[PDB]
């Protein structure tokens, strides 16, 4: 967004449940979770790392057909002030962390 | 090298099994690029 | 044969102790794993005794009568809060069982810890001694003291849901009260505490 | 050899108590790594199937001893039999598909297909029994498997546990019933 | 002027930081006392950020408008559980305040921490700078970062009941928006975390 | 971990920022030389064909990752299947002929024909895409091939990249469509 | 180890034949339990 426009954001990582929903819809509610929070400044980009927290040492990439809840958990990106004239935008992107590791090549039939 | 391996070794000579490489005399990048990364936290970290 | 076991601020003396029975390992010993990425944190306060009645034990109850107790059980303590605040969690149980009775009573209990039982077939009961266990003979001890490490396919059992350990108490021999003092019923309590608890992945507070 | 039994202390007395010496034997056929390492028959005339290791018959040596343990770890070796051209094998967690391509594959040689399956399941250990809210006052989850084989035509299947490591013992029971006679009495060749 | 403050798993970057303002002491430093007889135990998990909106800040609001925030405040987190499980408790606060706005806005906040205020007389406001404090000038910082040790007549403040610290934010000068960009309202959040928490005297679980 | 993003500097932060340690893993299945080295299926019931390596299906592992790279270098291994007596192979640049003699040739053994094809194309590198005056404001030239196989009878064909070296990365896309549900949700064995 | 054995050795590399194990760094019980047994006769043995 424009240099005069200012904003504050927070991102939070919600561990898999066992969650009756939820998910929290306000920053005050998401504050309890593994989160981080940043305001816009001279340094635009912010890099939030999402931890691998799961009971099993590895977890499936594909989602199994019967599921009513996530097995790897949510992440959410709250704005935290609700007064913004006007617009602005936050580009988002993703890249593998230093320790990420895939295993077992497979060539699934699509579709 | 690659998905090949045996306690022994290939029966045929290397000249027959694989094309020989030639140096430009009578390399990897993304490893270096990924190693250029700065994980060190910016600004004055506290607590 | 006095023995005094404290966890946290809680304590438990017993004068009929026959000794601790370590199961599967001499001591629980956690090691950090890849699966939590190091975010796990030990909590001192969870490690305390809490107790619950199992059953009145009368002479009416014959051989092979069972009383399983799924663990972890729902509880009002800090440990019962951690199942709600933190998802993934790890602990190794330390359990007493006490069936106070006149030594003139005759009978025996086989208290034992079964890892992950879904069901226990009628033939199967005789083999139950393979599991960590102790006997409660009124003529001798009135207290059993089993102690086990965390066990499971996953280093951090999912909060609630799966139960790794179950505390089974079997009536190995029927109660006898030849003195006819009554007596009669012999209440059987358990005195259980978590050890080496670890938690990971805090989740938003209810509601 | 009197001793308190309530403490469940181990006690093992040799006939030496009555003056008879008994040298220790170094048993090998009782060994887990040696016993579990065989091609137990598991299932007949079946095309596609999950390579769940609990499909083993419970009366067979390998299946019974496998159910004598709560947890286990095994590299595996599959051996299909019966007429077929080829056998595909999807590693654990791969999505199911009616058609298969490029997934690992083995042609038969003289109507036999043997190959080694590496341990694949994410869990550090599998288990023969799993208390998933099955509380009772009186089934294993799908992630517990070594893969998903499919055959071109229905085939007999064999599994062979390798580097077997059994954890946390569970009861064995004899399969035979004694009927009217308290001693079972069976024929011997 | 980037600064990044983490407590627990929570973090808070800010690029308009003017620096931490320690109050009354360079660092909180608990010492054991006679009054708990050594039963007190530190809890790692309580020390995390939690945040709450204070007020929209419009140009309509004149000098001396106050917004107190009693601390500790009721909260759903582990810290809000410890007030229910443990009676006596101790902590030293670490507080941010943020009023994000275009730098073309003009005005100022005086954010400050008042120990134990019952009331604040109308004359008294001018003196408010005696307390630990920072200013929020939109032309410069949008973030204040006060940090204070536990204070009180008792080494362990009673759970709930008494509140030692209160976070007051005063409108030192009225907001001005000559650019007329609107803007207009400027939300003011606080980002607060406990430090060096200690608890003593656990009490029976509700209900 | 704030940093200017305009400079496109690489940034990779571990959960250490929140106090969690993460040891580096030494990934092997992500490795190019290991992944590309497989017999991908390419084409069915075909006699004569150019051994163009872009005939690979784009949804297959090898084909997709091959299209994830702009340039590539590979020794190759061909494996024909299905009933046939023999398979000829003309090295790149050899003139086409309906009849063949003395050109390199392999008889089948049990209806399978595997053989190793040396890299043959004159170019120091091949490419999966080639900007030959295909400018746009919105096909690869024939020299890019490993040879020209002909079979006595139509046959299934497999290619196996060897000593693979991929250059200049290009985008991968998942093949699946999410339809009405934003999460794709698929069955697992 | 196990019901395997040859004067020679497996043709394929160990990496291909068997899954590699990993130490928890960047065990047996019932043997010990059976060895804990006290065969020594209790009380004052005589004759």
Q: Which residues on chain B are in Cβ contact (under 8 Å) with E7?
A: 47
Cβ atoms of A81 and E187 within 8 Å: the answer is yes
Q: What technique was this entry resolved by?
A: cryo-EM
Q: Do A15 and C205 touch (CB under 8 A)?
A: no
Q: Closest Cα to residue A103, out of D94, D143, D51?
A: D94
Specify burial of residue F151 (Cβ count, 10 A radius: 0-12, 13-18, 19+). buried
**Which domains are present in chain D?**
1-189 (2.60.120.20)
Q: What CA–CA distance (Å, rounded) separates F130 from F52?
A: 14
CATH fold for domain C1-207: Jelly Rolls (2.60.120)
In this structure, what are the phi and psi dihedrals at residue A49, rounded to the nearest 5 degrees?
A: -95, 130
In this structure, what are the phi and psi dihedrals at residue C88, rounded to the nearest 5 degrees?
A: -70, 140
Q: What CA–CA distance (Å, rounded) separates F14 from A10?
A: 18
Cβ atoms of E29 and E155 within 8 Å: the answer is no
3-state secondary structure (DSSP) of residue C129: helix
| Helix (H), strand (E) at residue F34 | helix F32-35
Q: What CA–CA distance (Å, rounded) separates A74 from A24?
A: 11
Q: What CA–CA distance (Å, rounded) separates F90 from G4?
A: 46
Alpha-carbon gap: F36 to the closest alpha carbon of chain A (Å): 10
This PDB structure is determined at a resolution in Å of 3.5
Cα angle, residue C125 at apex, residues C120 and C126 outer, rounded to 5°: 155
Q: Do A57 and D143 touch (CB under 8 A)?
A: no
Comparing CB atoms, the residue among D1, D17, D119 nearest residue G19 is D119
Q: Do C76 and E205 touch (CB under 8 A)?
A: yes
Q: Closest Cα to residue C162, out of C106, C105, C77, C88?
A: C88
Q: What CA–CA distance (Å, rounded) separates E61 from E58?
A: 6
How many CB pairs below 8 A link A and B?
Answer: 3
Q: What CA–CA distance (Å, rounded) separates D13 from B18?
A: 68
User: What share of residues in chain C are helix, strand, coil (percent, to 5)?
Assistant: 10, 45, 45
| Helix (H), strand (E) at residue C109 | strand C106-115
Q: Which residues on chain F are in Cβ contact (under 8 Å) with E11?
A: 17-18
Q: What CA–CA distance (Å, rounded) separates E111 from A58?
A: 48
**Which domains are present in chain G?**
1-47 (4.10.90.10)
Q: Do F19 and E6 touch (CB under 8 A)?
A: yes
Which residues lie below 8 Å from residue F8, measured CB to CB, with a gap of 6+?
none
Touching pair C, B by Cβ (3+ pairs < 8 Å)? no
Check CB contact of D2 with chain C, cutoff 8 Å. Answer: no
Q: What CA–CA distance (Å, rounded) separates E2 from F4?
A: 12
């Amino acid at each position: 967004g424009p240099t005069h426009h200012k904003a504050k954001f927070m991102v939070a990582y919600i561990p898999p449940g066992i969650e009756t929903d939820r998910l929290p819809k306000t920053p005050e509610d998401a504050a309890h979770c593994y989160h981080s929070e940043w305001d816009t400044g001279l340094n635009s980009q912010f890099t939030f790392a999402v931890p691998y927290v799961s009971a099993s040492d590895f977890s499936y990439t594909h989602t199994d057909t019967p599921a009513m809840a996530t097995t790897n958990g949510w992440v959410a990106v709250f704005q935290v002030t609700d007064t913004h004239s006007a617009e602005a935008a936050v580009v988002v992107s993703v890249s593998a962390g230093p320790d990420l590791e895939f295993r077992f090549p497979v060539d699934p039939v699509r579709q | 090298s690659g998905n090949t391996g045996s306690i022994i070794n290939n029966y045929y000579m290397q000249q027959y099994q694989n094309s020989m490489d030639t140096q430009l005399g009578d390399n990897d990048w993304f490893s270096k690029l990924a190693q250029s990364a700065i994980s060190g936290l910016f600004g004055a970290l506290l607590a | 044969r006095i023995l005094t076991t404290r966890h946290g601020t809680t304590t438990s003396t017993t004068q009929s102790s026959v000794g601790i029975t370590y199961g599967y390992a001499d001591a629980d010993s956690f090691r950090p794993g890849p699966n939590t990425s190091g975010l796990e944190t030990r909590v001192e306060q969870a490690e305390r005794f809490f107790k619950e009645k199992l059953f009145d034990w009368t002479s009416d109850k014959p051989f092979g009568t069972l009383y399983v107790l799924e663990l972890p059980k729902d509880h009002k303590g800090i440990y019962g809060y951690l199942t709600d605040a933190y998802t993934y969690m790890r602990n190794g149980w330390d359990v007493q069982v006490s069936a106070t009775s006149t030594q003139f009573n005759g009978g025996s209990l086989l208290v034992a810890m079964v890892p992950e039982l879904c069901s226990l077939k009628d033939r199967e009961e005789f083999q139950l001694s393979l599991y960590p266990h102790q006997f409660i003979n009124p003529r001798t001890n009135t207290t059993a003291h089993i102690q086990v490490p965390y066990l499971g396919v996953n280093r951090h059992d999912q909060g609630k849901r799966h139960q790794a350990w179950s505390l089974v108490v079997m009536v190995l021999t029927p109660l006898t009260t030849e003195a006819q003092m009554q007596s009669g019923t012999v209440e059987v309590y358990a005195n259980i505490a978590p050890t080496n608890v670890f938690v990971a992945g805090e989740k938003p507070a209810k509601q | 050899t009197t001793s308190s039994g309530e403490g469940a202390d181990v006690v093992t007395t040799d006939p030496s108590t009555h003056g008879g010496a008994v040298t220790e034997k170094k048993r090998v056929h009782t060994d887990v790594a040696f016993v579990m390492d065989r091609f137990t028959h598991v299932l007949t005339n079946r095309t596609a199937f999950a390579v769940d290791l609990m499909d083993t018959n419970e009366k067979t040596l390998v299946g019974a001893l496998l159910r004598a343990a709560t947890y286990y770890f095994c590299d595996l070796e599959i051996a299909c039999l019966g007429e077929h051209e080829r056998v595909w094998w999807q590693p654990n967690g791969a999505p199911r598909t009616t058609t298969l391509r490029d997934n690992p594959m083995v042609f038969s040689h003289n109507n036999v297909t043997r190959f080694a399956v590496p341990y694949t399941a994410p869990h550090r250990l599998l288990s023969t029994r799993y208390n998933g809210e099955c509380k009772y006052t009186q089934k294993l989850p799908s992630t517990f498997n070594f893969g998903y084989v499919t055959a071109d035509k229905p085939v007999d299947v064999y599994y062979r546990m390798k580097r077997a490591e059994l954890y946390c013992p569970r009861p064995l029971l004899p399969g035979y019933d004694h009927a009217d006679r308290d001693r079972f009495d069976s024929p011997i060749g």
